[PDB]
Amino acid sequence: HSHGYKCGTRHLFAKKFRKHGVPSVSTILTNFKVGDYVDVVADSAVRAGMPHKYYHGRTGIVWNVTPRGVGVIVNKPVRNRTVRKRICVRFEHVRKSRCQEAFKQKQKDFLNGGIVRAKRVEVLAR
């Protein structure tokens, strides 16, 4: 009866307790070449360029970097199909992914039962 752009975001865009405040320099010095995976975790302290809501926590590749924004391609399940969305986003709202950090570690490295001689052994009864 009232679904505006930020319906039901009372908890979703809340800052964590004692973790309020605008994004730091580690945020600002992160850089996004295109085709990078990213996490569209929206940060409330930054309001310009905030991701809708569905896109909160979604992962996707950057398809686009403008000076303050990171274009991100994020799949959305619409119905019988995953439409492939293009949210525009201020870079604060994009946390770079480690979604492939294991797999990159792999091609980094690509580059039974027996006698138990145990002696302590309490009875298990009630």
Binding site: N112, G113, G114, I115, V116, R117, A118
Partner: protein
């Protein structure tokens, strides 16, 4: 010319199947005598023996195909348990143990005995061949299916689907899932877990009995 070369092959294959299953018989008799020494060693040593865990379960769909949920319904398809008393051998990876845990009310399973493996592969064994469900009848039939110098005998198959195999997937996948008859003498309750006095779920080594009445 080829007519007789078909003989040189059919003779050479049982020479192989003889040689294979002579090894498998020894690899059973030896592996188990060795596994008796240790548990027997340990009893002398006042000491327990942690038997090696099962590396293969003979999962059996035990409820019918009606009223099943989309998650269970998918896991059963990926187990290839699409009918009632279908059976498959699935080795017990954590990822599988978490699939089996998702559909246990729909299945009975346990750790097949070598004998249970023989009876299914010899009696109920069917290869997929050109998508055809083909009753095993020749070792010729098996070597053609499995273009694999490892897998020639029907004894090759029983070792793979019992020892846990390096080709446990290569073998069990080329088998049509087993179509067992309902257990003779009946089940107990396809609704309760086995330890509840029912049927579904892991029943450890006891599956061999249950699965014996079926085969």
């Amino acid at each position: 010319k080829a007519i007789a070369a078909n003989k040189a092959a059919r003779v050479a294959l049982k020479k192989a199947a003889y040689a294979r299953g002579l090894r498998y018989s020894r690899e059973y008799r030896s592996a188990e005598k060795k596994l008796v020494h240790l548990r027997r060693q340990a009893k002398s040593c006042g000491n327990y023996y942690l038997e090696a865990k099962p590396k293969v379960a003979v999962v059996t769909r035990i409820r019918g195909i009606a009223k099943v949920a989309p998650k269970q319904r998918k896991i059963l398809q990926l187990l290839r348990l699409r009918q009632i008393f279908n059976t498959v051998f699935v080795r017990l990876n954590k990822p599988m143990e978490n699939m089996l845990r998702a559909v246990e009310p729909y299945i009975a399973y346990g750790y097949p005995s070598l004998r249970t493996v023989r009876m299914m592969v010899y009696k109920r064994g069917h290869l997929k061949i050109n998508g055809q469900r083909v009753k095993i009848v020749n070792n010729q039939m098996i070597e053609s299916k499995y273009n694999n110098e490892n897998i020639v005998c029907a004894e090759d198959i029983v070792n793979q689907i019992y020892t846990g195999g390096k080709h446990f997937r290569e073998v069990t996948n080329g088998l049509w899932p087993f179509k067992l008859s309902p257990p003779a003498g009946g089940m107990r309750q396809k609704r309760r877990h086995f330890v509840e006095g029912g049927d579904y779920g892991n029943r450890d080594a006891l599956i061999n009995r249950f699965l014996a009445r079926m085969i």
